[PDB]
Design a protein around this ligand. Structure first.
Ligand SMILES: O=S(=O)(Oc1ccc(I)cc1)[C@@H]1C[C@@H]2O[C@H]1C(c1ccc(O)cc1)=C2c1ccc(O)cc1
Ligand SMILES: O=S(=O)(Oc1ccc(I)cc1)[C@@H]1C[C@@H]2O[C@H]1C(c1ccc(O)cc1)=C2c1ccc(O)cc1
Lengths: 10, 236, 239, 10
């Protein structure tokens, strides 16, 4: 999931 | 334990106000979108750029980061179109009969007729926007409603108690704004009920709008982004 | 002059309780193991008979007969499945893990899988029933919530006269709000607890709307078990 | 329709 990666950024 | 419970009412409002995403602009092609392809292209491009700000807005919602990563994914997947619609509805308050998708992109229901099935959602959106204007909805009330949508629209689909405590905390915050604004006790619980009932209509608009979204995606009317496509497939 | 805005909260609860429709039985017998179409035929047979009771229950809701016949049709067309679900959820409070469709039809979560695509609706219904159990929902709160759905679910979906009708619906809704707060005051909850519980109740109506929209989706796709005549008219209103 | 008649029946 792309949403997985974007919820981890910093 | 979460930091949201220890936050006070005025501290809850300021955290929600500062976490607000910015109002993004549409692509600046001067053509008034009257086709099905250009309409859906402008809205898809706009919605995809807003989703990135929404993911970062959600992280700054008190209590959201205190959830498991899977729970964060579930809530945003359920509520993302609800968040966008109540954003569109709030921006469109001071433009009765129009929908301010962007400062440089204003639509009326006549343009909604150029996408077969779009006009029914537009009318509901316009009526929700008018209802917000008649209630004299405040910005501090809007951010409270928008985060309520985030925490509540996926709570029933350890973690449930935390969400319900934050939801209660936001409830105290809404009443706090109404008490600070000079409403009587009867006026406070009546206005509270009115604001939350509109959330039922925002859910209805999201589901009816989601139907067409993962149907026009199957028709491939406009090449959708992978992110917007993953947010769509989450709704079966 | 309407009588809905004239009643008191105690008289409001009394009216809603008296107007309650009965709990209908199913045509189920455990001797025949159902299939996908057999169970779907039972629920269709049950919900069709409930609709007749619900239509007559709607008349006895304070303020509903003060509306045009075309507006009464619209509210029921949009809210009928919501009314059925919150009734199902209310009957199932004391049966964890089970949905009490009827006193003789107590379906398990595993038995809901006997229809493809039904499991997700059952889990949302089960989660909703569990929520009413944790809140210890009162019957006086149930009748208020259920009548709220009738007046609120189609109020933003409909002329200067059409706007005059929506003004009356909001007056009745604000009255039912007071009635709920009145109930929570007699129970001894503090002011903070009344605002929180009131928000909890109305936030669940958002989920009931979600379940209705999701369920309505599959309902006008399987028809493409045969549906009832009145049930088809309720479905065409959602296309 | 059916919903029309039942709403006005009696
Ligand atoms: O429900 S919506 O109108 O979407 C449809 C689409 C087609 C039909 I037919 C019917 C409805 C949906 C709501 C609004 O119009 C559509 C849309 C959209 C969103 C994503 C997308 O990819 C396309 C449109 C919108 C939007 C709202 C707020 C925003 O900040 C941004 C966009
Ligand atoms: O929304 S429901 O789940 O409808 C479906 C059905 C199949 C699928 I696959 C998905 C959803 C819907 C909820 C429940 O299961 C379905 C159903 C039903 C309703 C109408 C009907 O004609 C058939 C069933 C039920 C019902 C609920 C409360 C009642 O008091 C009575 C019935």
């Amino acid at each position: 999931k792309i949403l997985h990666r974007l919820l981890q950024d910093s | 334990n979460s930091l949201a419970l220890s936050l006070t009412a005025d501290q809850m409002v300021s955290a929600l106000l500062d976490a607000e995403p910015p109002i993004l602009y549409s692509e600046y092609d001067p053509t008034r979108p009257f086709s099905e392809a250009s309409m859906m292209g402008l809205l898809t491009n706009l919605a995809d750029r807003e989703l990135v700000h929404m993911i970062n807005w959600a992280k700054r919602v008190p209590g959201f980061v205190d959830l498991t990563l899977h729970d964060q994914v579930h809530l945003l997947e359920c509520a993302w179109l609800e968040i966008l619609m109540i954003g569109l509805v709030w921006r469109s308050m001071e433009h009765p009969g129009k929908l301010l998708f962007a400062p440089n992109l204003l639509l009326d229901r006549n343009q909604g007729k150029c996408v077969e099935g779009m006009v029914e959602i537009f009318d509901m959106l316009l009526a929700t926007s008018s209802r917000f204007r008649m209630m004299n909805l405040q910005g501090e009330e809007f951010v409270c409603l928008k985060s309520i949508i985030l925490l509540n629209s996926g709570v029933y689909t350890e973690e449930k108690d935390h969400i319900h405590r934050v939801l209660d905390k936001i409830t105290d915050t809404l009443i706090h704004l109404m008490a600070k604004a000079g409403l009587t006790l009867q006026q406070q619980h009546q206005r509270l009920a009115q604001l939350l009932l509109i959330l039922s209509h925002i859910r209805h608009m999201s589901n009816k709008g989601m139907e067409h979204l993962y149907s026009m995606k199957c028709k491939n009317v406009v090449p959708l982004s992978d992110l917007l496509l993953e947010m769509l497939d989450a709704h079966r």
